[PDB]
Structure 1
Amino acid sequence: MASRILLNNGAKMPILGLGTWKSPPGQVTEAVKVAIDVGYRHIDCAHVYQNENEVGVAIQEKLREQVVKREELFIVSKLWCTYHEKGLVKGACQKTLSDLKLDYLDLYLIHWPTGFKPGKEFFPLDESGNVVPSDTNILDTWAAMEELVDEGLVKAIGISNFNHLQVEMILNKPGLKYKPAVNQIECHPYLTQEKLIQYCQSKGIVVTAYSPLGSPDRPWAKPEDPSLLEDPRIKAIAAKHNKTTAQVLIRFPMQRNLVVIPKSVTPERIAENFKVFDFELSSQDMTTLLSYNRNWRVCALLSCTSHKDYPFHEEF
């Protein structure tokens, strides 16, 4: 298994990265330091995670210690929904760069296709609990992302949580300057995304799988929800390979030519999760894992379901 995948800008993206959603500031600096020490070179960040300063601390320390050089790292961040207005995009990117202590991002994503009312609150709600949209649209936000590439702030741009019609809208823009390099989407054995992955890969867009472990730590989890990491069928596949369930869940998307970004702040798990380049899932294992699909999505938000651009009404 080759460790990097070629993007449309000629750059190579590591297929395994470290996720940072719900990595608390008081723990994420150590997580990123350990990750770099054990071989991670891709870190998935976002302004909405409220920890970019502490991620940046770790990166800065490992650059100063001469453990890695900047060109070897692949740092991803994302434009939050309250910054979709064309006049707000650059500032949002520069805030992320300042927090991360970087002079460029390797990849910058539109975090969701939905623009929200600008302001301090990340999730601005009306008095009845509905998200308050902004009068923004995907194509104008994309054009503002393109300017970031032209100014050297980011090397590549992409999208996240876009359905295929939303991807198509960008692809079909006449004066398109840059195609999206990546679509980052939820993907795991309970949400295998066959149709959207086929679509994106057919269009030369690399897919990154988020929540590959099923995001057990997500704040809206209900005790009756399915649990990937505790699924005895997946456990049995892992035992056959003398691997952990998490290792199987990370290797699975890798064998579908996806990038994958498992999150941990636990040093032993950060190290375990990287040890996925030394075994292979069989054809039968892959078929079995794909067969667990239930179209079950962990990242969904009821308050956002009436937004005009909410992505999950479409089949894919």
Structure 2
Amino acid sequence: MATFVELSTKAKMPIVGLGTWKSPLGKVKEAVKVAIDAGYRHIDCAYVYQNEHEVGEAIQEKIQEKAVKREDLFIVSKLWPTFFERPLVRKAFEKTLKDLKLSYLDVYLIHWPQGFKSGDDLFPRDDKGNAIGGKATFLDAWEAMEELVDEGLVKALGVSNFSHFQIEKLLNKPGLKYKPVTNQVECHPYLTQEKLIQYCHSKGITVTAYSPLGSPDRPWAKPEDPSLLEDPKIKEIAAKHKKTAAQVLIRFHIQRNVIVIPKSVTPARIVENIQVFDFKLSDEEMATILSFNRNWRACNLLQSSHLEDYPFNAEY
């Protein structure tokens, strides 16, 4: 189904993908199967979601049943920041690839720019809940990740939650073998990322929008927190096309040429979320939606600010 966004490597990244954060075991498998049936080809995964082994089962089921070919799939995973020391990059990725039951990843992302204490405690923190840093940096990680590409275990590298300063830091590293093909960040009408998107696009870096629906199931959600799916102005635009709010929030990205990865394990929503290629938001509707920016992050902590390379203090 989906149209694509051309990467700098000329690989074609499907513009709508399936999110898998918090997709439970015993539902993520069916989620993936339904999505591939509905025409999804891009699946967004991560080591830290601890459900890649169930994602792997589903992908293998559908390739073996002729529903899809491996080369038409676009599989993305992410390296967690406790594994930034070189030998741990390899062991984490190998766990990821084995779980996914694949011979290669299409894209491997640095999940978060700050290094955390190395090892298999994924969330090292002090008593007060603040992150514990490790000395390895995202540049150390990138180095070991470039080997995976040399060996063809990964077709391309990317970053996630990077501000333009840290991408500059990355692109200006003397000795860089490969460049990031995407920057995966939170993006939606409340956090429109105009400056970051402009920046990345000018450096030949695509943007992948995460939490496009305002991530309404996030466990740290307060009832006073803004809710994009219930936003009357968003709902007004959807009604105007006889579409759902989710469909408008997804199509918003497509029209900015931004890749977008709504998560669902509900078959109807998964199908709904990819029916976004039969309407168009007008120029005035795009303008209106863009105006909703209030720099609101659904995904934030301030529990790791004390570490170097915190991405959200910068303006973009």
TM-score relative to the length of structure 2:
0.98
> Which consecutive segments of 4 or more residues in structure 1 shift more than 6 A?
none
Residue 77 (structure 2) pairs with residue 74 (structure 1) = no
Secondary structure of 1:109 counterpart: strand
CA RMSD of aligned residues (A): 1.1
Shift of 1:206: 0.6
Residue 106 (structure 2) pairs with residue 143 (structure 1) = no
Name the residue aligned to 2:308.
308
Secondary structure of 1:18 counterpart: strand
Q: C-alpha deviations, 1:17-69, integer Å up to 9, x for none?
A: 00000100121000000000010000000011111011111001001111101
Name the residue aligned to 1:208.
208
Shift of 1:148: 1.0
CA distance in 2, matches of 1:138, 1:37: 37
Secondary structure of 1:114 counterpart: coil
Name the residue aligned to 1:116.
116
1:248-267 → structure 2 map (5 Å cutoff): 248-267=248-267
Shift of 1:157: 0.3
CA distance in 2, matches of 1:51, 1:68: 21
Name the residue aligned to 2:182.
182
1:276-291 → structure 2 map (5 Å cutoff): 276-291=276-291
Shift of 1:119: 2.6
Name the residue aligned to 1:4.
4
CA distance in 2, matches of 1:43, 1:138: 24
Residue 22 (structure 2) pairs with residue 13 (structure 1) = no
Whichever residue aligns with residue 174 of structure 2, its letter is: P
CA distance in 1, matches of 2:25, 2:162: 29
Conservation of the 8 A alpha-carbon contact between 2:88 and 2:119: no
Name the residue aligned to 2:223.
223
Name the residue aligned to 1:97.
97
CA distance in 1, matches of 2:98, 2:145: 18
TM-score relative to the length of structure 1:
0.98
Shift of 1:121: 2.2
Name the residue aligned to 2:241.
241
Aligned length, in residue pairs: 316
Name the residue aligned to 1:154.
154
Whichever residue aligns with residue 7 of structure 1, its letter is: L
Shift of 1:2: 7.2
- Which ranges in structure 2 are unaligned for 5 or more consecutive residues? none
Name the residue aligned to 1:40.
40
Whichever residue aligns with residue 6 of structure 2, its letter is: L
Shift of 1:137: 1.8
Whichever residue aligns with residue 177 of structure 1, its letter is: K
Secondary structure of 2:75 counterpart: strand
Whichever residue aligns with residue 73 of structure 1, its letter is: L
User: Structure 1 99/186 Cα, relative in aligned 2: closer, same or farther at 3 Å?
Assistant: same
Name the residue aligned to 1:173.
173
- Which ranges in structure 1 are unaligned for 5 or more consecutive residues? none
CA distance in 1, matches of 2:274, 2:2: 14
Secondary structure of 1:303 counterpart: coil
CA distance in 1, matches of 2:150, 2:272: 39
Whichever residue aligns with residue 74 of structure 2, its letter is: F
CA distance in 2, matches of 1:136, 1:309: 12
Instruction: Using the TM superposition, name which of 85-94 and 185-194 deviates more.
Output: 85-94
Name the residue aligned to 2:133.
133
Whichever residue aligns with residue 304 of structure 1, its letter is: S
Q: C-alpha deviations, 1:208-232, integer Å up to 9, x for none?
A: 0000000001111111100000001
Shift of 1:127: 2.4
CA distance in 1, matches of 2:187, 2:148: 28
Secondary structure of 2:169 counterpart: helix
